[PDB]
């Protein structure tokens, strides 16, 4: 649908099998979740951080659905204050910014 | 304008009478610029994540123009990877997220 920005743009997402709230974040390149149980095959990911490598897993072949749109994407699992839907998943979903 | 997310959603802005480029960032509550000189008193604020917690400055009565729209409010000044137009400013121009 169509979202104004008075509230943070949290949306309900079905990721893998599970329902989570995630923020649509046009400033973020990737889609990251924390606190999650993906059944997928994951691979480790190298992400440089303060004090060394952050603990970050990558899941491909992830069913993602937001507002009826069902897609297969890539989800990073790592430390993040909220779940974020970055531009990688927004573009697969035809999301535009309007003004 | 109607702006897709294949690239980083940068636009031209006039902040405190000066032209800049900034990323339209739906995941940021506030607008922040680096490397600008504003008139008047500031207040200490902090923005975080990791990279750490960053002490920043908040200025008031600051004019922002995005496509002939105009708002006079607060902005943050401090270290930031790119200039950022946050929700606080994007609501003042009518911006929406459409999926």
From Swiss-Prot, chains A, B:
Signal peptide location: none
Superkingdom, natural source: Viruses
Segments forming domain Peptidase A2: 20-89
Region entry Dimerization of protease, spans: 1-5, 49-55, 88-99
Active site per UniProt: 25 (for protease activity)
Subunit and interaction comment: Homodimer, whose active site consists of two apposed aspartic acid residues.
Protein name as annotated: Protease
Organism this protein belongs to: Human immunodeficiency virus type 1 group M subtype B (isolate BRU/LAI)
Gene field: gag-pol
Range covered out of full length: 501 to 599 of 1447
